[PDB]
Amino acid sequence: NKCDVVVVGGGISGMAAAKLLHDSGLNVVVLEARDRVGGRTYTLRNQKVKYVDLGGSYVGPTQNRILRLAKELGLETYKVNEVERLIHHVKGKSYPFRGPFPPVWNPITYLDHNNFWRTMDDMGREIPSDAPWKAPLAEEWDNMTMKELLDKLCWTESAKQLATLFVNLCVTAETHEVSALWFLWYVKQCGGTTRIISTTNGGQERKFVGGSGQVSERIMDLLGDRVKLERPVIYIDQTRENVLVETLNHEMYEAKYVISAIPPTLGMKIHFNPPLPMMRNQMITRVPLGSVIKCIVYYKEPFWRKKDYCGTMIIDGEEAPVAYTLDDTKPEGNYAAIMGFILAHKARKLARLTKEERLKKLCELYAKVLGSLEALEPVHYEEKNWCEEQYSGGCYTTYFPPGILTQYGRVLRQPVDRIYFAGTETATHWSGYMEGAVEAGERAAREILHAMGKIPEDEIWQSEPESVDVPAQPITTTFLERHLPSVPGLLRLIGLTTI
Amino acid sequence: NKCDVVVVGGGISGMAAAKLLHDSGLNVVVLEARDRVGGRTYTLRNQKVKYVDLGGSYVGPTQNRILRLAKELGLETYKVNEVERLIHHVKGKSYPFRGPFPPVWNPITYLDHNNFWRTMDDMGREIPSDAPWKAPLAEEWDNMTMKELLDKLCWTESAKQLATLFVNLCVTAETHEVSALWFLWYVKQCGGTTRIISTTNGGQERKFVGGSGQVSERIMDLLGDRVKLERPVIYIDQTRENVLVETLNHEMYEAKYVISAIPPTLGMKIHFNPPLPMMRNQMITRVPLGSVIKCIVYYKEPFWRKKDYCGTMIIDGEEAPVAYTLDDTKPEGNYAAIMGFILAHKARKLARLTKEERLKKLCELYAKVLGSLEALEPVHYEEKNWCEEQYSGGCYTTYFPPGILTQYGRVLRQPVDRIYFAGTETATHWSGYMEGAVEAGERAAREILHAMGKIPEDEIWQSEPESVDVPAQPITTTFLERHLPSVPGLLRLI
Ligand SMILES: *[C]C1=C([C])[C]=C2C(=[C]1)N([C][C]([O])[C]([O])[C]([O])[C]OP([O])(=O)OP([O])(=O)O[C][C]1O[C](N3[C]=NC4=C3N=[C]N=C4[N])[C]([O])[C]1[O])C1=NC(=O)[N]C(=O)C1=N2C#C[C]N([C])[C]1[C][C]C2=C1[C]=[C][C]=[C]2
Ligand SMILES: *[C]C1=C([C])[C]=C2C(=[C]1)N([C][C]([O])[C]([O])[C]([O])[C]OP([O])(=O)OP([O])(=O)O[C][C]1O[C](N3[C]=NC4=C3N=[C]N=C4[N])[C]([O])[C]1[O])C1=NC(=O)[N]C(=O)C1=N2C#C[C]N([C])[C]1[C][C]C2=C1[C]=[C][C]=[C]2
After folding, report:
1. Beta strands per DSSP E along B35-118
2. Are residues B22 and B92 in the same domain?
3. What residue numbers bound the domain in which B417 lies?
4. Number of separate domains in chain A
5. In the UniProt annotation, what is the result of changing residue 170 to S (chain B)?
């Protein structure tokens, strides 16, 4: 019934917010729609897999908040396998390589590839992490899709195709679906192209031993009876002295403040009194989540390692159901597995198949890419289609279509009377990730602590010390990477020699 | 408690569906979230205005369903004033004209303008009204915004600017916000560019005497106690023999079938058991409504008529709050008024002002465009910002961002077990309009009648006889309009 703060949503963001408020001495209640906590993280346990993350999983250097929270909860990380060679599969052939980037040998294509990634980061530097709509060319960039930007920037089909794969993989959406400004912001606020794409020294460096679901589960353990499962919030009333929060199962909760720790669009599932201000009312109809099926195929042994492949495959082509894989073998070397993402339109297309049909397609793909008949002999299979989730709306996160971020972006974490907004979508560093969830939950919590006069304004936004366990190497470029001309740049240099 | 069909939403679509089912002998209940019916139609009555439509208002030739429904309810139409000259205001100067199209005098600009409108209709002819995703180039066109298409097609800034205004006015959204495929479908399914833009012989020919709100109000009168106001639906349960529909005020309704007659995205306000199928689950987060403030400025007299202006103004430029106006004077010639729409980003920008501040901006604009100091002396002002409406989400209708219509379009009116889908967004002719609302409501109703074995499959989709009161003249083109080259076509000839 009565508490200090109602937190709506028991994902990482809501749990992090509730923990901070609980630790500060406030009475908190978490109202969670599902029969479980974790939201877009979900760790399945059974005999065949031991444990497997079916949602958010990877953490890496510079994600210091999730690392600190998980450490405090008694969790440990392990390194994703990147010992052996990566594979880039393009036009039906596999090309093994080392490093974060597939090598390009053609001098023109090389210039084009180099310029693309460089320009992405160049443009990113003009975009404030906490206010992308304040970029000097915000309107121009926001009124373009990523498809249009790629069309302008890439002078080779090879660069365009790889850039397209990158967008699909990063934001589980098609290039024509998403704003260029938003996508450029998204990459920049993760620390740039190298940081976001890398396993070693990047976002995919590590996973949690036992699964990421333990973060939310262990906070629930600490909070005990304060977490209310199967309590979908349907109604928030702010007309009276205390905020009234009603659930689908007829329960009423009274609080001084509310944290909304759900994906922005899922705010639509709540009826508000009084009605939301116009900008938020419309914003929450304009911010969809992406489309993905996470698929894990299990094998007797990590046979790819014997062929000097680490299990990472970058697979281009419309025919391939999965565009990207990682070795998902346990740190102990057992429960050998390949994790793959079925992205964007392919998630839509292939969801029509049975689980068995998808497994067959994945195995046949892996067999060609790895050039191994062993890939046709899976021992087990797990998958999760996040598009079907009423209380997620998709995965990994919310994307912004053209025109939305500049018009509605400033509303995202603007308080509505006594409602404050968490959720990874409101983060300014690794928004979209578990890291962003922690940043947002704790920031929203501190906004309430400030509103109560418990902390100064200066303390709402808090810096995070670097993890000692997961140190971050700086992102470097070579002299040539910095100064080599683009394709049109080289052509302009040829045009000048003609005179 | 118990009935045959629960209709969720008491706008024109829900009311039309409920009326059809009621007339067929079924027990129907309409659950309406607001303290009123009408939804995106709303007629305000007071002493100063008599009546004024603050939402949907215009009807015209080829919109035979709304005309028939309104007639049956005892409503009449009158003609919007287009006797005198229209005005095109561009680069700070007013250019009076006659006919539906503002003239272009620069020869190259003429070719470019002509080609743009012609190409819009050409492209539309390849788009099936009932399945736009089946267009031969559906994917190509859906993966482009209207901004991109305009950038490709328009060789002059003049044509591009007017085309932009057209998009903003048509769908209350920016050109960069909307799919080219969806927009081209939208125009085609209203009967093409001329039909959609025209007052005389087009969508804006007429209004209802007494206001369009009377359509929903008069059906509510017929249904009586069957319409439940202030009953926002929060929960639909289809796991049992009968469908259970729960409202915010704690009431439970049991039915054999449900019609959802709300904007697709407002389906998000309902928790579903079992969960919606994946495609619909995601679709309803991908389909926003546009942004508009409808503003009506009242004057002592329709002074513009004295200067041989009808009151229609097409106003170019970022500075102008309103891009398009019509005379909103009563058929009797009193309650003189100019109606204007504040569109898309301007609705967002100008909503920050006070009502009085917006009035001042509108009056100053009208004084400039009409060249009349009389515009600075309003006697009254009414406005409605539809962006603030929890149970509409915007106006006039739902738009599709790039990539959505091909991926999710087929889900729009696909039944989910015993839930059938109405709402103007599911119409195939004048979707977005009151006409589409009637088409969709009656079609959804008939789907249920078929499911009950009461009518054959052949009768789900029903043709509508042409209105005798509002006859449609055919849309014609001239030989030169058909065969004059585009700008790149002329350059290829050179
Ligand atoms: C799904 C997913 C997947 C599949 C994958 C992934 C992911 C996901 N991610 C993301 C994460 O997960 C996120 O971010 C988080 O989790 C979020 O959190 P938050 O914010 O908290 O949210 P959520 O969870 O959702 O929660 C919410 C809650 O609430 C609730 N509700 C609703 N509604 C309601 C409620 N309640 C009451 N009432 C009402 N009404 C619900 O239920 C819930 O619970 C991720 N992340 C990270 O970090 N990591 C990872 O890994 C992940 N993942 C992914 C990724 C991928 N990647 C990275 C890729 C690979 C390679 C590459 C990439 C990218 C880029 C480059 C490269
Ligand atoms: C808003 C608006 C405005 C401002 C204007 C306009 C409009 C609008 N429009 C549209 C109409 O209105 C529509 O379409 C209709 O109305 C629709 O119907 P429906 O489908 O039925 O829907 P609604 O109304 O929305 O209803 C729904 C209902 O439901 C309810 N709910 C929700 N949720 C819920 C509920 N319930 C229970 N539960 C829950 N959960 C609500 O409340 C409601 O009631 C229009 N239309 C026509 O026809 N006309 C007109 O006029 C209109 N408007 C406009 C237009 C414009 N224009 C035409 C322009 C001028 C010149 C030109 C143009 C365009 C193009 C070219 C040229």
Report:
1. 43-46, 50-53, 58-59, 77-79, 85-90, 93-97
2. no
3. 1-39+61-76+209-287+401-461
4. 3
5. No loss of activity
Residue A152 · residue A124 · CB < 8 Å:
no
| Facing B275 at nearest CB: one of A275, A282, A390 | A390
B463/chain A closest Cα distance in angstroms: 34
Helix (H, G, I), strand (E, B) or coil at B145: strand
The β-bridge partners of B259 are B7, B420
Distance CA B140, CA A306 (A): 44
β-pairing, A309-315 vs A85-90, is parallel
In this structure, the answer to whether residues A380 and A456 fall within a common structural domain is no
Chain A CB within 8 Å of residue B252 CB: no
Crossing angle of helices A12-23/A434-451, nearest 10°? 40
Which of B160, B168, B266, B286 should we substitute to test contact with A (largest number of A Cβ atoms within 10 Å)?
Answer: B286
Closest residue to atom 63 of ligand 2, CA basis: B170
Same domain, A84 and A204: yes
Token pair for residue A231? Answer: 């309590």
- Read off the CATH number of the domain in which A438 is found: 3.50.50.60
CB of B57 within 8 A of CB of B36? no
- H or E segment at A327? strand A324-327
Residue that finishes a domain, picked among A361, A385, A400: A400
Instruction: For residue B57, give the ligand 2 atom closest to its CA.
Output: 51
Our measurement of the distance from residue B189's CA atom to the centroid of its chain's CA atoms, rounded to an integer in Å, reads 12
Domain assignment present for residue A477? The answer is no
- Same-domain pairing of A128 and A167: yes
Cα distance between residue A57 and residue B233, in whole Å: 37
Closest-lying ligand 2 atom to the alpha carbon of residue B432: 14
User: What DSSP assignment string belongs to A337-355?
Assistant: EEEEEEETHHHHHHTTS-H
Q: How far apart are CA A44 and CA A144, in angstroms?
A: 40
**CATH assignment of the domain containing A112:** 1.10.405.10
A222 and A154 within one domain: no
Put simply, whether A281 touches B (Cβ < 8 Å) is yes
Closest ligand relative to A313 C-alpha:
1
Determine the residue type at B466: E
Q: Extract the tokens encoding B220.
A: 């509510």
Q: Which helix (H) or strand (E) holds B311?
A: strand B309-315
Residues A127 and A236 in one domain: no
Bridge partners (DSSP) listed for residue A130: none
* Chain A contact for B95 (CB, 8 A cutoff): no
Q: Are residues A393 and A300 in the same domain?
A: yes
Q: From B197, B228, B247, give the residue that closes a domain.
A: B197
Q: How close A71 comes to chain B (CA, Å)?
A: 35
* Helix (H), strand (E), coil (C) string for B265-289: HHHHHCEEECCCCHHHHHHCCCCCE
One domain, residues A142 and A174 = yes
DSSP A357: H
Asked, as a colleague might, if the bond just before B302 is cis with ω within 30 of 0, I would say: no
What does DSSP assign to residue A145? B
For residue B238, give every residue at least 6 positions away whose Cβ sits within 8 Å of its Cβ, in sequence order, or none.
B244, B272, B273, B274, B416, B417, B418, B419
At residue B155, φ and ψ (nearest 5 deg) are -90, -10
Whether residue B487 is contained in a domain is answered as no
- Rounded CA gap, A244 and A253, in Å? 6
Indicate the DSSP class of residue A179.
B
Give the technique used to solve this structure: X-ray
The answer as to whether A126 is a domain residue is yes
Residue A498 maps to a domain: no
Helix (DSSP H) and strand (DSSP E) numbers for chain A: 16, 21
- The count of C-alpha atoms lying within 13 angstroms of the C-alpha of B451, restricted to the half-sphere facing its C-beta, is 19
What angle, 0 to 180 degrees and rounded to 10, lies between the N-to-C axes of helices B146-153 and B157-171? 150
CA-closest candidate to residue B146, choices B132, B135, B160, B157: B160
Q: Is B226 on the interface with A (CB under 8 A)?
A: no
Integer Cα distance of B83 and A74 in angstroms: 80
